[PDB]
Design an enzyme around this catalytic site. Structure first.
Site, short mmCIF file in Angstrom:
data_model
loop_
_atom_site.label_atom_id
_atom_site.label_comp_id
_atom_site.label_asym_id
_atom_site.label_seq_id
_atom_site.Cartn_x
_atom_site.Cartn_y
_atom_site.Cartn_z
N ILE A 97 -15.80 2.58 -8.52
CA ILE A 97 -15.53 4.01 -8.67
C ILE A 97 -15.95 4.77 -7.42
CG2 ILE A 97 -17.74 4.69 -9.68
CD1 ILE A 97 -14.37 5.76 -11.15
N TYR A 111 11.91 4.08 4.71
CA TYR A 111 10.74 4.39 5.52
C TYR A 111 11.13 4.70 6.96
CZ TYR A 111 8.26 2.41 1.53
OH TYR A 111 7.79 2.15 0.27
#
EC number: 2.3.1.57
Lengths: 168, 172, 168, 169, 172, 169, 172, 169, 169, 168, 168, 172
Positions: free
Chosen positions: B49, B133
């Protein structure tokens, strides 16, 4: 064809415990013995990240639990693993085995890039040997008194299949 | 398309992540560790986290419907580089939301993280994405041969990059 | 031919620190930066069991430290790794590179069973590109401004070699 | 003065560090935590040994005699800045080695770490130091008033900076 | 040969173990985890010091010279099985000490651990060893094809077994 | 504007915090550690809940509607200084409550914590903010050049200060 | 007296501390926890090595001989106060080193720690010490009755203080 | 009596366990550790949940009504032995289900765990129990004198055994 | 034989222990946990150093030469019982010191620990040992059949006991 | 007389936080500073077993929270403690102080067996000094600039009472 | 008079173990049983900071170990403790007991400020009861079968002395 | 009285314990550590849940109403002794339930724990209780003077005992 494979989740542990009932054999989770549901969930939490074993729950279109497809003793250096399929008694004789066996070989040989997949079958269940034989497996060993199954040591056949033949 | 909004990924969005990795038929990683179960993902999310080597952003619309995911991985703040990966849900794949998400990602990478280069990897057997892209300013810097084992075959993958110099300037 | 490869030990960490001197680049140990000897030994203790990187110390017959052969970012699912060889300045121009490069490819392709081994070379050192090219490596990428080397971003060539060609 | 060598700080050099902080008449910090005894420093060195917010280099000579210390604190890799501080042992304070140490510090900051800005703090009551850094490329960007309590008085401190652009070009 | 003695492996013998795994040119494992450095071995030895899934025995002579190693792995006390591996130092490989070590190992496995079966694996490209074990009472139960990747090639390996019934009885 | 009340930050207010840091276009830190998700902040709030280096106050009104945030960071109790930052929700940015919040912040800094100096940072490209703090008692002590990378550009930042002596007298 | 030097207390000085607390016949504390054994002291020293609520300084001479101890306890950086205690070894008690140690302590407290007030406690049955501190600038602010149980009797103790204002200025 | 089913002990069944140990007038142990309260047992069940030295099975009927408990303690996998104990709830003590539970216990011991010997302990002052196990295949191998302190008296206890050889053949 | 002295087991004596368990041809346990190497024993000695379920005494002579070991295992302080085992080094097996060690063991069991019963186990194929303990006060209370797997055979074992009442009177 | 003393519980922490509001002084819990409710409950959990401070909540017959009676810096060797009473603003001027002060002295001198109980009062609140004086406390110190209360150092009186006089 | 009391140190643990030899009684360290030296040092390390028991080693002028003075079960609320003195057999009958008993009472009543000090003596050792009686202790209990000493339960006398009489 | 039942104390009974210790006006202990708050009690209960040095038993009636508490403390299994304390709620104090609880406690101590002696402490200023225990078989073995500080005064306490010999036999 409608059958789907899904990685094993916590909720599916009850289905695992029910599958073990009526088998009469010591159940192992990452090479550790268990017999109660609470023993199982604890070990599922502790081996949640161990990638030496991968288990998939097989479901139908309406999501009824059909069985389990588990790969154990996965070794990524030699690229091998032991395959084991367990169909629930409700759907045992409906012909789901060959489809689930192909689904397992597909994941093993096209996503994990394993070289060899072996399984163990009881010599006293010859029709199961014919099943796996007709699926591409060939006998490579006849282990004598390998397992203690209900008060006696039994012989077990080890059969393999290489990535080379499944892809070609 | 301008109604889309980028939001740092929360725990409540992990379900949306799991549903994305399926049907892709590719090993899914979280901070460079494999997973394929929702519970396996959740445990890895709580363990990393606070790890700033990777950042993921959920994109939603005014309806708060989940449209896709933007993730930076392999972030290094000494060389100021990162790898870019974009994933749009199958329901919204064809409505041209991608270009907005790509620009939003590069805007975050080059104006907040102050990164110097952003690279990505695309399959050579998907010229649609390679062309998308190139339209967004990415240039091919590598044709890595047999780099990935996809669908039972070793395939080549294109590595494309864009520099902070081009993105911020060019118009200047 | 007399040169031998040996797995990296704690005592060899001083040789690693000395090799870093005169390189003028940030040194990493399992993707973590270090600059002092004490920082290195601590991370060697914490990553002692991580098999994502393997380092071998190269010695001669009389056990003089020649250089280092390190494989980093080892991925056993795709079977790839990044190769990097570092020869001490004392023995740089004595021709030990090609032998050590073959020793590294031997371990990677005949013990670990890896499919691909790639390396990174500076475009501003063309003779090094010719070395690896004559060793079997082929260019697969020209990375633009990939590394910050002494006050400026530099281009770096990525070159590979597959297990198929080294064995045949 | 080309004989001086920069070397990453080792645990053994913590004695040299402790001896330098004596005679300074100032609270010494190790990763924003105060300390006074050699034991307090050795423990905090073990705790922050892999923290990248600060970086300290011991400078020696050809004879390996310790000359001084170069420390970079408050290193932020998003804004690419850091605070610089140079401390020379009283034995070699007047030998005129400071400029070379300052440039060797800036060379590591701007050529290896890829930082954009390096700032330092100098007491206003030490104009010789202000001039020194001025001749090394530093410019005054602030006159912080009563910033520090030094020698029983709240004193003003100059903040000086140099950018990677100027040093490289 | 009768002057040889089996001794539970101690920490001081790990150096003797490291020197054995070199020149074999095969991945060395300790409780099913890889290692190739002396320090890596020592750390694994201290972590599995109390693990009873594997046991290793150093064999020495009256001179206290180290002759070889005997190790049981994959020990399971419900099925009462274990895998057997023998390694003799190159200096004593040809003096016929092996048969004594094999019998000492089976005597420990079948009379102290009270195991039911002992199996081992041998390379098919080493008929000398396959013949040695057949002399000691081992029977082939498997010809595993391409089970191991040795020296740049997938090779076959023979799996041979012996039961507690034969070892303890037979003469009876 | 005398209706506004300062209240120490509670765990429940971390939602208000997260919503304020959105729309800012800046990397947000909690005790010198970056964060972006509500979950990252809640975890770091639990880790630094008893750290005295920073102190944050939520400002509400009579209706208990949240108005803004007052945070004091880099609090050093030896030099008795701290950095001040005020953030008002977009809903009430133009209502002219800033001055009262600034003085209520300085009142806690100088009348309870016994700090000597409070400094703040303002972008040079926001002269209205510079004037605001100037009319509250802050004086410019530095013009930090290219201090921060804001909106894709290295920008200059003013550092402004006020001493406990002036505020009390 | 000007040859004396103050040095932050190290572990090697704990022996010197233990020998000081004996013959005093008073409960000895370390960060507000009792001790009377050398090992008990050493363990407390390692546990509070980083606690900045108290600081102790060993004083030595040019001969590096240990002369005494200076300690600040109950340090609070919000009110900027601390308690002062001085202990000189019996061998050097009468050579007038105390006044130098007291001034060195106040100089550290008021010019480095930037404290506002320093207080101390002295036994009412020791007018020699009360007079020594009054000479050094301390003023009585309290006559705490029966505050301490010393030598089988509850005795009174004088609390005396000095402010940073007087120490730094006064001469001004 | 073929309706009874053996099921591995679950955490929820610890209430049934606690109620059975009441009325016994004996110190109850869980993995060789004494306990008396439901909370003490729940904590020790969590600590020894993966210990293979003991194994306990709850026996239910077709209606899922709890009938009794079958526990195997002191399980040694080298000597392949274990101690057996059967406890039937007072509600069903006289219904004559004991023999079936004893054989279902021996069936798990000898057909799945592969144990060689199973021994049990019975009070000498309960000859009906001695006869019961005698008719199930158990033989007396010991008359332990003053082995246990039961009801304020040191009493003798019979140790009875049965081997895997007899049960299977 | 009055020269022999009992001494609580120390860590240094673990070498003597290890050497005694060699030559026995039996799995050795330390607090119901198996071991074979000197290192395994030293680690388990550290873990169970304050466990009161077992107690081991090293017996020396006047010259401090080690004679044997006396260990009491399975010590239960509610039932006040324990299992006794005596092991004499091969050097002094035939010197006839056993009886004195057995009584010195019973003296500690019954005069200091206040135990009620002490039982021991002897192989049936060692009748000289059975007679020995019989002449020391032990009586047979059980003939456990195929209790242990010794030398490749399931063998019978005698269980012998003596009560605190007899020894004291 | 109807007022009752009760050991402090977790639920009462909200009342503690409300009492701190309108005091304008740094609040301490076992010599550790706190300002938010969450900071308080965490420290209450960590110092739950520290017997150096004991706090009692004062309630009426209908269980309305009147105030708090806290003993801090309890030393059982010298048998001393610092007393502090805090009455809620709702019931400040209703005369509950003297009763609560006697209840505190009762617990300190008849259950804990303490020898001395001292308190600290602001010199700038003389009527409070007269209160404690009429309750048996006598001045033993006039601490100069002891506390920083609202932008200025203030003098604080230290007053004591011995177990001898309260019992006789 | 030359005898000195010194707080117990790690090195003195061997002297403690030797004192226990020839006593034939279970030794306790902070209410935990021990019999070997290694058991003792471990518990000394774990109870190093527990102030419920204080032990002093008695030495002569030349630092020969004479005995031990230990105060156990120290309760600072009621201000009580149990006293126990152990003289080495070498110096048992030389008259050091009364001096060491006064030294113990001095520390207990003039430094710890305890109200009561009680001890336990065997009824079967009457001359020891006369010793403590002549030292100021008075019998307050005759505990029946309190301790198990060498194969039989024995009666033990509990005798006390109050701080009031020792100081006056 | 015969309808009363003894039950090992559970967590749900701690509330009943707290309400008992109030109005007693005496320091309450749990495994020899003080407490006066419900939360302080609960935390100590969870920390000593497995400590067998003390055992407490709740007594309830057929109505499941809580009548009182029985607790053994200072239990030692080498000397086989324990201290006995009985507490009945004020609502049921006068209905003569005590004698049953005392006998139930001694029956548990002497027939299950197999203890040799049980002692208790009673205030000398409470001759009612001293007489109650003398009726139940307890004999005075000590008159400890000024052992406890109760209600602002040092008071004497009687220590009374009973042996397993008398309880189990006597009738024999």
């Amino acid at each position: 064809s409608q059958l789907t494979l899904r990685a094993l989740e916590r909720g599916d542990l009850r289905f695992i415990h029910n599958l073990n009932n009526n088998r009469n054999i010591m159940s192992y989770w990452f090479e550790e013995p268990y017999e109660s549901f609470d023993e199982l969930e604890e070990l599922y939490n502790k081996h949640i990240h161990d990638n030496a074993e991968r288990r998939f729950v097989v479901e139908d279109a309406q999501k009824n639990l059909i069985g389990l497809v588990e790969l154990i003793e996965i070794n990524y250096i030699h690229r091998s693993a032991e395959f084991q399929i367990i169909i629930a008694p409700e759907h045992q004789g409906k012909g789901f085995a060959r489809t689930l066996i192909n689904r397992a070989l597909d994941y093993s040989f096209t996503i994990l890039n394993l070289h060899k997949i072996y399984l163990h079958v009881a010599v006293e269940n010859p029709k199961a040997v014919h099943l796996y034989e007709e699926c591409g497996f060939v006998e490579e060993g006849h282990l004598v008194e390998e397992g203690f199954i209900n008060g006696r040591y039994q012989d077990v056949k080890r059969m393999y299949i290489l990535q080379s033949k499944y892809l070609n």
